[PDB]
Scaffold this active site. Sequence first.
Site, PDB file in Angstrom:
ATOM      1  N   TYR A  78     -59.368  51.942  -2.230  1.00 19.12           N
ATOM      2  CA  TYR A  78     -59.973  50.951  -1.359  1.00 19.12           C
ATOM      3  C   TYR A  78     -60.416  51.354   0.026  1.00 19.12           C
ATOM      4  O   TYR A  78     -60.818  50.502   0.821  1.00 19.12           O
ATOM      5  CB  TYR A  78     -59.069  49.732  -1.325  1.00 19.12           C
ATOM      6  CG  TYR A  78     -58.683  49.366  -2.735  1.00 19.12           C
ATOM      7  CD1 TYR A  78     -57.439  49.730  -3.257  1.00 19.12           C
ATOM      8  CD2 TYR A  78     -59.607  48.755  -3.597  1.00 19.12           C
ATOM      9  CE1 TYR A  78     -57.129  49.502  -4.594  1.00 19.12           C
ATOM     10  CE2 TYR A  78     -59.300  48.525  -4.938  1.00 19.12           C
ATOM     11  CZ  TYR A  78     -58.063  48.904  -5.423  1.00 19.12           C
ATOM     12  OH  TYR A  78     -57.753  48.711  -6.746  1.00 19.12           O
TER      13      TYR A  78
ATOM     14  N   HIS B  22     -55.326  48.229 -16.365  1.00 17.15           N
ATOM     15  CA  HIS B  22     -54.465  47.048 -16.512  1.00 17.15           C
ATOM     16  C   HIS B  22     -54.786  46.060 -17.627  1.00 17.15           C
ATOM     17  O   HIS B  22     -53.933  45.248 -18.003  1.00 17.15           O
ATOM     18  CB  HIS B  22     -54.418  46.262 -15.203  1.00 17.15           C
ATOM     19  CG  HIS B  22     -53.838  47.024 -14.055  1.00 17.15           C
ATOM     20  ND1 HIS B  22     -52.567  47.553 -14.081  1.00 17.15           N
ATOM     21  CD2 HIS B  22     -54.352  47.335 -12.842  1.00 17.15           C
ATOM     22  CE1 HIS B  22     -52.323  48.159 -12.932  1.00 17.15           C
ATOM     23  NE2 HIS B  22     -53.390  48.041 -12.162  1.00 17.15           N
TER      24      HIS B  22
HETATM   25  C1  LIG Z   1     -57.880  39.781   0.092  1.00 19.58           C
HETATM   26  N1  LIG Z   1     -57.166  40.962  -0.405  1.00 19.58           N
HETATM   27  C2  LIG Z   1     -57.185  42.117   0.461  1.00 19.58           C
HETATM   28  C3  LIG Z   1     -56.492  40.942  -1.680  1.00 19.58           C
HETATM   29  C4  LIG Z   1     -56.513  39.671  -2.539  1.00 19.58           C
HETATM   30  C5  LIG Z   1     -55.839  39.657  -3.787  1.00 19.58           C
HETATM   31  C6  LIG Z   1     -55.143  40.798  -4.268  1.00 19.58           C
HETATM   32  C7  LIG Z   1     -54.432  40.732  -5.605  1.00 19.58           C
HETATM   33  O1  LIG Z   1     -54.469  39.680  -6.261  1.00 19.58           O
HETATM   34  N2  LIG Z   1     -53.784  41.828  -6.034  1.00 19.58           N
HETATM   35  C8  LIG Z   1     -53.049  41.977  -7.285  1.00 19.58           C
HETATM   36  C9  LIG Z   1     -53.697  42.988  -8.251  1.00 19.58           C
HETATM   37  C10 LIG Z   1     -54.058  44.295  -7.529  1.00 19.58           C
HETATM   38  C11 LIG Z   1     -54.922  45.198  -8.400  1.00 19.58           C
HETATM   39  C12 LIG Z   1     -54.741  46.667  -8.097  1.00 19.58           C
HETATM   40  C13 LIG Z   1     -55.635  47.507  -8.996  1.00 19.58           C
HETATM   41  C14 LIG Z   1     -55.160  48.941  -8.998  1.00 19.58           C
HETATM   42  O2  LIG Z   1     -55.304  49.668  -8.022  1.00 19.58           O
HETATM   43  N3  LIG Z   1     -54.573  49.374 -10.105  1.00 19.58           N
HETATM   44  O3  LIG Z   1     -54.148  50.531 -10.186  1.00 19.58           O
HETATM   45  C15 LIG Z   1     -55.118  41.997  -3.481  1.00 19.58           C
HETATM   46  C16 LIG Z   1     -55.780  42.070  -2.209  1.00 19.58           C
HETATM   47 ZN   LIG Z   2     -54.139  51.224  -8.178  1.00 21.88          ZN
END
Ligand SMILES: CN(C)c1ccc(C(=O)NCCCCCCC(=O)NO)cc1
Ligand SMILES: [Zn+2]
EC number: 3.5.1.98
Length: 356
Positions: free
Chosen positions: A285, A122
Amino acid sequence: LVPVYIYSPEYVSMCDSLAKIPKRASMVHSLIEAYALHKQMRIVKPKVASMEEMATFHTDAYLQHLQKVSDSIEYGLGYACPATEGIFDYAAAIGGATITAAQCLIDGMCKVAINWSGGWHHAKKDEASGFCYLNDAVLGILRLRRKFERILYVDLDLHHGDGVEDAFSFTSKVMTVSLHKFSPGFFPGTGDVSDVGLGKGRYYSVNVPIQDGIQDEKYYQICESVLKEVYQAFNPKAVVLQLGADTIAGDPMCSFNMTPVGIGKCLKYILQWQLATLILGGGGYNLANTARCWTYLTGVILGKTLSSEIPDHEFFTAYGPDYVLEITPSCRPDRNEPHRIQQILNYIKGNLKHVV
Ligand SMILES: CN(C)c1ccc(C(=O)NCCCCCCC(=O)NO)cc1
Ligand SMILES: [Zn+2]
Ligand SMILES: [K+]
Ligand SMILES: [K+]
């Protein structure tokens, strides 16, 4: 002819320090070692990336800031990408680990290199995003450019690889393919089928928007189909593959509904072209399941077929309640109306014609 494996106690411990996925690196390496798969691979220590190597993609202003930090709210250093102490050293280790892996491909030292702790897709040239402070996938591709003229990037993570796509959306030397969930409000919110690139890079960006529930068969059909048209019209020289396991059933993300066997077929298909191949990780995760996935995959890379019982090792207790290597799909509906999948695949088909 033996796959390269980017390992190193100093590296794995460095990776375990990222708060979003505590100890995932150890778990993955450990499970792979418990199956003694490192026994059939060329273990290679990774070299830390230099400020000049990172600069091949990221700006100095950004790199200077990442360093200072290790007005952050100007580089995307907040909630998702905290201004943690040491991230700079952390990012450098992962960037270098992917660059170190790329160099091996351009030295005939192997036809496949692996770095599971990489795949942070990203990150923008001057901005951190979605937990990524540095884009190792791009650094890896920019390094493969030294020898290869046409690189193909396949992103099988649950999220659209926006960072890598943007980096090359204006060129036809590198083509990106991303199969990801697409739906309003779902991070990062880009990558609809209409998205195909800009300028001299029009059509050299392929995006397969998908919905929840998709299982192995439906997924491989879709992937196999597209990877087919693409190998046809692009005729790639080398391949970079991101395999985030957040697509696998059991992930707290709860969107897709895959098992490592589905992604495995997709991996087989890509390996069948015998082109140089750089394997990367990404999201994931459900720690135990991510290890289950990447171990099994390290296993299809080696042709071997692993045991259903999880070998005892340092993390054996985290594999309950069944303690096996297979993952069972969850009982919930696939929300992919078969007619829409066809519209998309055609829309793709048409777009590939325009390539040379
Ligand atoms: C407390 N908790 C379980 C969370 C808190 C914040 C996020 C979030 O900002 N998410 C937005 C960005 C997600 C990044 C995903 C990375 C990925 O898998 N990319 O492929 C998510 C979960
Ligand atoms: Zn992902
Ligand atoms: K492109
Ligand atoms: K993806």
